[PDB]
Design a protein around this ligand. Sequence first.
Ligand SMILES: OC[C@H]1O[C@H](O[C@H]2[C@H](O)[C@@H](O)[C@@H](O[C@H]3[C@H](O)[C@@H](O)[C@H](O)O[C@@H]3CO)O[C@@H]2CO)[C@H](O)[C@@H](O)[C@@H]1O
Length: 441
Amino acid sequence: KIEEGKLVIWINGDKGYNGLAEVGKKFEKDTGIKVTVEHPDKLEEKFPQVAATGDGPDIIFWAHDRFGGYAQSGLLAEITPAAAFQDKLYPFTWDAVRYNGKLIAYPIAVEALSLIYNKDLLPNPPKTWEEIPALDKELKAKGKSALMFNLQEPYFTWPLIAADGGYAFKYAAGKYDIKDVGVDNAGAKAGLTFLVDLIKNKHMNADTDYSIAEAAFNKGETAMTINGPWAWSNIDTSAVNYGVTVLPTFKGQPSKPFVGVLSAGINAASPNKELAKEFLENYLLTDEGLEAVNKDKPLGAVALKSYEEELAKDPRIAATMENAQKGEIMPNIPQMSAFWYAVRTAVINAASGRQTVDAALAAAQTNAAAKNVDVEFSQAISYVNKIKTRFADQPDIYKHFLEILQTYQREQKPINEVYAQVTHLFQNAPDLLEDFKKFLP
Ligand SMILES: OC[C@H]1O[C@H](O[C@H]2[C@H](O)[C@@H](O)[C@@H](O[C@H]3[C@H](O)[C@@H](O)[C@H](O)O[C@@H]3CO)O[C@@H]2CO)[C@H](O)[C@@H](O)[C@@H]1O
């Protein structure tokens, strides 16, 4: 039910949506087309649900890592920029929004996490993660803390996890191997273990989130934080004098932040694709438009060459790009969301103590990696054997088992309803219910 003759835009609540709304108001005056900018929570999760039936915004803003999943699901229109417009943007940013040979979004800005530190508490920031524990002890004797940052989102903890060898998907010459995940190798384990020890030795608190960390840094309570360029404007208001620098090294190796490219995608079900392209190309992606958003919340290093050549003179931008060079630009493949969900659970479970690092990351490795088809078939054989162990007197049990799985596909049965059908059929014991979940998660 996307209405024709208007533009509805979704953008995350930490970006400069008020500045984006002003670009929209200039668009409305020139064209008569009302532009509405909304920032719903979890918009990156709501968009696949509403767009699939033809609803949702005309334009969705998010980092490029979500967009490949959207495109594979037929939710994004293909971008049709003339060659002259494409030359206005850096080629590596166009690469970030390319999926299966097609441009599926307009890139806006390059984002990378940096180390933000209080120059009146810490004139020289630490070069290594390893010295932070003793630095915290010295600062705790002066009524301060060393480091506070968002421990709830794996975006913020991944640079340390990846530093010694962790990775999301192995890049093998032009394709990401969705079967080669590096979430439970020795490097990822060493990085998450340093994180959990920081919490264990009371240098960080597992409950710290984005807002707790931002308030503590902007009040001068903690000497360091980890954040992106969108956070700089609130620090400008705070009276804290801060520097933006390269993240600390772990085991002598640089932290590797996942680099995001903020991108605007056009809903495939939108009846306003021409209006969306005009707004994005001729209003937002200009010096005038980006400055309007950038003055609300800084965007990072923008994709537009003309505006970025002036933004690159900021040492905070130069530090952002230095951290980007040491990190890796994110894959956009559809498997990214499962990777992020798996790592979020692992960090949270390990940080709180509910699981060891090794257990937490082994479960995340299985959740993020594609199935080993030879392994699962052997488990299917073991599962069949288990049925015969407990139901030797029910010769029709396999016929009814297959019927459930067939009807699942033929009639679009919800998965949890399939689960109830399995537990009722195997009414004797629920081990067959637990064993079944792996085959259909
Ligand atoms: O943790 C569960 C969430 O995992 C996924 O979110 C990813 C994003 O897809 C990824 O872009 C990055 O988000 C950051 C974003 O780039 C930045 O502009 C914003 O200001 O900060 C974000 C970090 O909070 O990292 C997160 C993972 O932390 C998934 O898409 C999302 O639905 C899950 O809820």
